[PDB]
Write a protein that binds this ligand. Structure first.
Ligand SMILES: CN1CCCN[C@@H](Cc2ccc(S(C)(=O)=O)cc2)CC(=O)N[C@H]2CCc3ccccc3N(CC(=O)N[C@H](Cc3ccc(Cl)c(Cl)c3)CC1=O)C2=O
Lengths: 213, 207, 151
């Protein structure tokens, strides 16, 4: 990236937050720096323009700064719904082209922790008809946004076929995730007990199923 | 109401061509510079091309430079981008963005259109149920390509407490799961749709 | 000169419709579509500037006593002072074009509609030759239209 941003900045709630955007004479040195917010799912939406001018609907707690050939964004008054990638952009007179920064994934890490709501799902009869089987583990409402997901079968741990999605933030601010243990129909029939462990900030939640429902 | 709506993106082979198509609404499209911004899933935004109000000033990013052509039709309120000889590395969500003439700020954006450059064929999803063995039901959308799919519970009516998870890529096939936590003891149907296969499945979950 | 051709034709039309008080309906050849929206955004902005700075323009007019074509061509000496200071912006530009338009009106009252041609040529020279890389950077007349567009 030509404009250079930190990959990940953070702060606890209430604090000042600063995301810098290191420019160049021909980009930030000549033209303005424009900031865009990208929440979890959304498209970017203009956050700050002409260095420090906020549009309609961007609060007084977002400030902008241009310091020669660099640019701070200040999120003065942190909130758990500023989990977003912040992108600066400047027109570059040398390139005759727009250039965005790498992106800075802001995060808040002072909220009260919540343990994961784990939920294990036995394979679909319809999928068993296709000689395949997937145990699904929905992992919802954890914070902070990190979980390791393990799988046992009959006491013996899994190494093959298991997958886990990356954590996605919820409307609640707490994140969610999903693990998928994939077995054959032969495998599903030849093993009885299937555990599924989610370890979250030192504390393992676990829900199993025995095929005999 | 001021909206940008991108169409055209989908599955193209490495080498193929694709025309992304943006529609501008509720403003005077004939008086703004337009912009294509692309974003590789997971990675940061990259600017790709700009075009002034009456197509006289055209600008491209180095990567797309040569292979992509930007154009607009101020009669049809439409911006275009002819993506030619696409390589795997062009798999991105291509947003469209309006430009404030007074600040060059990209103020209005669009929702974005996923482009997926691959050899893999368009496999439709296989919607299976996720019921237990106060009750979190769900559905497992298995073995589709490309992204995206949409899942809505009870035809869009049930939307609170629907956790629709990020998809995983086992082999060259996507797998997504959604799930809703519903009161126990009336039906609960899940409405998957894969517009790359013209697929539309409703599927009833019964414990 | 691609920009001078685009500019001169967009400037001339605005000058000549101000001196007329009636718009020219024939199509633009050189500036194409980019001139149509420019003159429709020159008519709007330059009428605002001409009312804001009637006093100023009238004052510069009575000082710079204009009678003949050589008075019109020697306006180049004072007209550059809209940039002799460092600042370049579209406000300075529509003020340049709005004053030339105000002079084209004056030229009509003294029956000098011949001298609107070398006024338009005088204005485009001061503007294109001196501030080209600013103009090209700021998307030319495409930018002119975009910058002053209001909605
Ligand atoms: C020796 N200097 C001094 C040159 C260096 N300093 C200038 C810098 C400056 C230039 C233009 C603008 S503007 C209104 O275009 O944003 C702002 C600031 C100071 C200045 O001109 N202030 C103006 C303020 C009032 C005014 C308003 C409209 C028109 C003329 C005005 N007049 C009257 C005037 O006679 N302006 C001559 C220059 C000028 C101006 C504007 C035009 Cl359109 C033409 Cl043709 C000429 C003076 C001259 O030649 C002023 O005095």
């Amino acid at each position: 990236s030509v404009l250079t941003q930190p990959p990940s900045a953070s702060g606890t709630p209430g604090q000042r937050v600063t995301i810098s955007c290191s420019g160049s004479s021909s980009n930030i040195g000549s033209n303005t720096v424009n900031w865009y917010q990208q929440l979890p799912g959304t498209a970017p939406k203009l956050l700050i323009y002409s260095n420090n001018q906020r549009p309609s609907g961007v609060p007084d707690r977002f400030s902008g700064s241009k310091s020669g050939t660099s640019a701070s964004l200040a999120i003065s008054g942190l909130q758990s719904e500023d989990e977003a990638d912040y992108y600066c952009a400047a027109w570059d007179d040398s390139l005759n082209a727009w250039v965005f920064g790498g992106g800075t994934k802001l995060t808040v890490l002072g909220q009260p922790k919540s343990s994961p709501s784990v939920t294990l799902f036995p394979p679909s009869s319809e999928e068993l008809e296709t000689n395949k089987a997937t145990l699904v583990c929905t992992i919802t409402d954890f914070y902070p946004g990190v979980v390791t997901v393990d799988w046992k079968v009959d006491g013996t741990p899994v190494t093959q076929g298991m997958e886990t999605t990356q954590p996605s933030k919820q409307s609640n601010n707490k994140y969610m995730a999903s693990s998928y243990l994939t077995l054959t129909a032969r495998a599903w029939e030849r093993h009885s007990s299937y555990s599924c462990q989610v370890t979250h900030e030192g504390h393992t939640v676990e829900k199993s199923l025995s095929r005999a429902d | 109401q001021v909206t940008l709506k991108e169409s055209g993106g989908g599955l193209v082979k490495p080498g193929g061509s694709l025309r992304l198509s943006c529609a501008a609404s509720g403003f005077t499209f004939s008086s703004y510079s337009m912009n294509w911004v692309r974003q590789a899933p997971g990675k940061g935004l990259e600017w790709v091309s700009s075009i002034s109000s009456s197509s006289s000033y055209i600008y491209y990013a180095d990567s797309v430079k040569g292979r992509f052509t930007i154009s607009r039709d101020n009669a049809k309120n439409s911006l275009y981008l002819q993506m030619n000889s696409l390589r795997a590395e062009d798999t991105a969500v291509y947003y469209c963005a309006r430009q404030v003439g007074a600040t060059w700020a990209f103020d209005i954006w669009g929702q974005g259109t996923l482009v997926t450059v691959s050899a893999a064929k368009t496999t439709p999803p296989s919607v299976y149920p996720l019921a237990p063995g106060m009750v979190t039901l769900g559905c497992l959308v298995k073995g589709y390509f490309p992204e995206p799919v949409t899942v809505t519970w009870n035809s869009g009516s049930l939307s609170s407490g629907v956790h629709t998870f990020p998809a995983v890529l086992q082999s060259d096939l996507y797998t997504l799961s959604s799930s809703v936590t519903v009161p126990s003891s009336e039906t609960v149907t899940c409405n998957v749709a894969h517009p790359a296969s013209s697929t539309k499945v409703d599927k009833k979950i019964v414990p | 000169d691609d920009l001078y051709r685009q500019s001169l034709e967009i400037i001339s039309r605005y000058l000549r419709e101000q001196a007329t008080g009636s718009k020219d309906s024939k199509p633009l050849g050189e500036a194409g579509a980019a001139g149509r929206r420019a003159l429709e955004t020159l008519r709007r902005v330059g009428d605002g500037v001409q009312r804001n700075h009637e006093t100023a323009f009238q004052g510069m007019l009575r000082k710079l006593d204009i009678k003949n074509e050589d008075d019109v061509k020697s306006l180049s000496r004072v007209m550059i002072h809209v940039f002799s200071d460092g600042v370049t912006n579209w406000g300075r530009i529509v003020t340049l074009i709005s004053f030339g338009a105000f002079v084209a009106k004056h030229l009509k009252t003294i029956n000098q509609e011949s001298c609107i041609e070398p006024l338009a040529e005088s204005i485009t020279d001061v503007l294109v030759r001196t501030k080209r890389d600013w103009l090209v950077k700021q998307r030319g007349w495409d930018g002119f239209v975009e910058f002053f567009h209001v909605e």
